């Protein structure tokens, strides 16, 4: 009568970064038994700042492969890009059951370590049948937040993760979530993407605006042929003129185009400055650019045609 | 008897959504850089209330493609034309506006206030932002405590300085805030409580002399994430760029590939700051890289754009890590 | 085929305060008929400083006879009291087509005055489909707003309005919207309260912590008989020693006592250092002073037992 | 050879959460003031590292039951024992920490450094962020660099200045932040970078001497809302109440019932300040009262509880309503 609860670990400084074993992370919060039955299995053991399209993968397939066997899971994780692989996830797993990752500001032996009442907090979510549905969520400083709109805000502070744009889903208190929220956008098994077979993901790279922006990144990547390029733009998407001139060349040579945003909150919108229809590029709504090239990457799996694809950008 | 008399003000225009216009007032779509000084001045009557306004055009542009050029024209422009007037408003778009105040901030000698203005709706929509944004940057740059404050920008019945402060959101009409330190004072009724004024070194405290300066060092920028290519930062190091800031994930750390090719980028004579896309808090020292062993330069609590600017300036008087480091320790 | 919209005024700045009727605010924006058809009544001429109950039922009631002849609502209302009455309709509104209250920072007649905008994306939102079943609604700086969460954040910020604890709803750019949330408290039509037949409310005051708080103003609604006393506490709820006993003495004497905070964000919560259940106080969670006393009013309409009030607090 | 030596560091204990202490590390059941100093400084082993610390128990409580004798108690502490030590860390509740660290900010002549801290969860609780507050706590009290700057409070990394600094959030270890115009320094590895100091006088350039005073004047606050009784304004003009705060609604504004019995109050001699129950932002002058015309004072970004301070001390030197406005101007 305790739920059946999962740890995935992959690292981090919760376990510092990527050195403690999931076992000994695991073992320093006995206060678990109170909660839940917990099984600990270790994916990989890095720093998140070097995370890639392989672990992904790795992840979506264990736990839509292992989603009968439990009745949760948690995933331990890097702060760096922990943003990127909760929404990898949300957009890929299909399993309902609640999805939670979980990191630490601080290493274990760190005057006032966030990690262990963090893993507490994320088993509890995990545990809590009101937090399927959901999609995958990030359980860090007492709150629940959506794998979507989540993103880390100060390089220090262990209350960096919130939902900037939309908010959290619920606060944590005494073991018990207050959910008031959820996310609208499609995800998990209301998603098309299915990584089931699939061993690499599409080529997409980043490239950043600011004044006198060189051309040079974009033209590496368009003269490497990748599949899609997300830009971080200026203000809400705008592209340094060189920039513009190269990705509008690339957009219409084979390379998919995102318009994102540098800037840390709102919506990079059509119908402002930027003709999107006409250069045939996408603008990336709230996804920043880290979480647009996730869905870029998964859009061109189903699609190479830049209509087809903002309407991805529209759903999900 | 005594007579009231106004300060001098130059609004030098360069340009943005302030200066933008579109077909509908309700619509969204617009383009920039399309109505002169002139108009803007005549949209704000009450601007003669507070002040003698002069305005020069000295280029019509989105802001999205501002350049080293126009830096230095503005620069030698306040620094050159320092006497000649009571105090400067920029007219600028807001996508880089923090980039050409910090710029500014660390080029002008003129210690009279430099003011910069935007707005985040163009010229013609209903409840313009821009007129009153900047009949307050008047206001600022004519108040005699803005001076010695360093370069500043005013948005939103707000005075930032040139330094911390930053767009948050892509259309909010509050989106400028200095987000690590705050800002400086508010404006209400025409009048400033200033509060705080930046510690770190700026204007005429700065060694940096663009008077003769024709161009400026090449330092550009690569982005960290998950997978992240190596390839734009091999394609800055093959062109010869002088310095690269790196838009590191968390505290300024970088994904394996990218600090492979900086670290023999470094060895080589680059100069290379870590930064973060994080967009608050400082990328520090002592932390998850060993900036001494690397010759790597932490940039602190400037953004990637911004450690560009200071780079860029850095560049101008020496190439060794160490004394770059100090730079960003100061400035 | 555009919508039937009815703008019900009350006043506040974005008619100045209240000096300006309803006919000269919507004829000052011409643009509204490529939207709506607005037709205007006149409810009050007032600061929203002088917000008082009447008001409040008059409008639940004209709201509620007139559902069935419009297509959506928009209130014109000051700022200072908008989240008050926001989070009053919510609860007694039976309609669940849209209801929308707008207001303005700056008059008419000031250098970029934020009403003419506001007002008009206040009609947007009222007209949108979308709108409807979500509570009643704000509307302001471009952000669709919940009537539970949404309060004033800063004394003349064009951008004062904010969902603090949960966050907007949608953010409206090009006249549309992009709904992502919607509240999960039960609103309108599925709260009990129903205030058609009432001409007034029970007597519910507000006292504020502090160092060295003096007991007078407690005592001062006690000896008139208050139905109710709501506390803005310092940090979670927590009460001043002389308040403390005071209000315990009214709890057990036919006061219902709430327990909120004027920390602005955040829940007040059960489990920390007061022992509700045996004071006979009721958490008000993330109610603020003044939007549990919206509520605790409404409560006491059906019940005098705090354990029935803090179910209260628990549902809407 | 020279020889390193370590700060003398005072810590004074009131009590708070960060003595704090419940049955269970994992239930959020707590009782405050239960835990004596010396437990705290042994729960930090480092502080060895960065200072000698000396601990002295005022009182243990939670500082929900703060009070002008305690107030009274620590600055004439502090300033009977400024020559004794390098420097103070009063730990104290986080309920109204923002209203001590105002007190003693106006009434401390000491000008070495006084630094307040608490925690949000107990000494007891898992992940318990009381002992890294203490040691940050600790070093910046320790450093040099902090002197000057008023009485400050460290939580959660930060230095904040003892007038903007408020509590934000119910429950969150970052709930405290300077609201207005943002913090003074971040805390990394023992270091702090320090840019910005609080322009409004304090400490030793105020002239708020409590060294003889065994009380303080009465003043009360009231709050504002829609239909708002003016029965707790009534009570506290009846008590005979040497001031009143009001807790406004937007820009200060009052409902009509409470604006009327303190513009009588107002009249007879009761000094009256407009604050606001908005989080952040000044009450103005200019807006929708005619202060002036019935003698009341604006609180400018003071909230309703801080004005109570300022009020308080004030009184002790006027109960002239122009007077009173230039010191909430001044200070
Ligand atoms: N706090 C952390 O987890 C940072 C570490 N570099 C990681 O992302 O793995
Ligand atoms: N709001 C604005 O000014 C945006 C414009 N693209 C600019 O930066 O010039
Ligand atoms: N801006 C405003 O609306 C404030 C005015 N006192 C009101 O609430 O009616
Ligand atoms: N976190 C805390 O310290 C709360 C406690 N009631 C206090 O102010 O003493
Ligand atoms: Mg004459
Ligand atoms: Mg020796």
């Given at each position: 009568?305790?739920?059946?609860?999962?740890?995935?670990?992959?690292?981090?400084?919760?376990?510092?970064?990527?050195?403690?074993?999931?076992?000994?992370?695991?073992?320093?919060?006995?206060?678990?038994?109170?909660i839940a039955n917990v099984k600990g299995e270790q994916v990989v053991?890095?720093?998140?700042?070097?995370?890639?399209?392989?672990?992904?993968?790795?992840?979506?397939?264990?736990?839509?492969?292992?989603?009968?066997?439990?009745?949760?899971?948690?995933?331990?994780?890097?702060?760096?890009?922990?943003?990127?692989?909760?929404?990898?996830?949300?957009?890929?797993?299909?399993?309902?059951?609640?999805?939670?990752?979980?990191?630490?500001?601080?290493?274990?032996?760190?005057?006032?370590?966030?990690?262990?009442?963090?893993?507490?907090?994320?088993?509890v979510t995990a545990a809590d049948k009101a937090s399927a549905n959901?999609?995958?969520?990030?359980?860090?400083?007492?709150?629940?937040?959506?794998?979507?709109?989540?993103?880390?805000?100060?390089?220090?502070?262990?209350?960096?993760?919130?939902?900037?744009?939309?908010?959290?889903?619920?606060?944590?208190?005494?073991?018990?979530?207050?959910?008031?929220?959820?996310?609208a956008r499609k995800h998990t098994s209301d998603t098309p993407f299915?990584?089931?077979?699939?061993?690499?993901?599409?080529?997409?790279?980043?490239?950043?605006?600011?004044?006198?922006?060189?051309?040079?990144?974009?033209?590496?990547?368009?003269?490497?042929?990748?599949?899609?390029?997300?830009?971080?733009?200026?203000?809400?998407?705008?592209?340094?003129?060189?920039?513009?001139?190269?990705?509008?060349?690339?957009?219409?040579?084979?390379?998919?185009?995102?318009?994102?945003?540098?800037?840390?909150?709102?919506?990079?919108?059509?119908?402002?400055?930027?003709?999107?229809?006409?250069?045939?590029?996408?603008?990336?709504?709230?996804?920043?650019?880290?979480?647009?090239?996730?869905?870029?990457?998964?859009?061109?799996?189903?699609?190479?045609?830049?209509?087809?694809?903002?309407?991805?950008?529209?759903?999900?």
């Amino acid at each position: 009568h305790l739920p059946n609860i999962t740890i995935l670990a992959t690292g981090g400084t919760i376990a510092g970064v990527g050195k403690v074993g999931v076992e000994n992370l695991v073992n320093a919060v006995p206060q678990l038994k109170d909660i839940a039955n917990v099984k600990g299995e270790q994916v990989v053991n890095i720093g998140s700042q070097d995370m890639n399209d392989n672990v992904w993968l790795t992840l979506a397939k264990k736990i839509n492969t292992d989603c009968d066997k439990t009745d949760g899971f948690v995933i331990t994780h890097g702060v760096d890009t922990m943003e990127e692989t909760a929404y990898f996830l949300d957009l890929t797993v299909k399993c309902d059951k609640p999805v939670v990752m979980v990191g630490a500001m601080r290493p274990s032996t760190s005057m006032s370590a966030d990690g262990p009442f963090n893993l507490y907090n994320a088993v509890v979510t995990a545990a809590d049948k009101a937090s399927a549905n959901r999609g995958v969520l990030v359980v860090m400083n007492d709150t629940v937040l959506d794998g979507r709109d989540v993103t880390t805000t100060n390089t220090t502070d262990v209350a960096t993760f919130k939902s900037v744009n939309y908010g959290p889903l619920g606060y944590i208190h005494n073991g018990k979530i207050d959910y008031q929220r959820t996310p609208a956008r499609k995800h998990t098994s209301d998603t098309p993407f299915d990584v089931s077979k699939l061993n690499e993901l599409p080529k997409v790279g980043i490239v950043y605006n600011y004044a006198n922006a060189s051309d040079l990144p974009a033209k590496a990547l368009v003269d490497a042929g990748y599949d899609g390029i997300v830009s971080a733009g200026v203000g809400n998407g705008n592209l340094y003129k060189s920039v513009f001139d190269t990705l509008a060349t690339a957009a219409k040579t084979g390379t998919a185009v995102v318009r994102s945003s540098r800037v840390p909150t709102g919506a990079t919108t059509q119908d402002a400055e930027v003709d999107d229809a006409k250069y045939g590029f996408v603008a990336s709504g709230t996804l920043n650019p880290q979480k647009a090239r996730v869905l870029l990457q998964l859009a061109l799996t189903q699609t190479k045609d830049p209509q087809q694809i903002q309407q991805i950008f529209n759903q999900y």
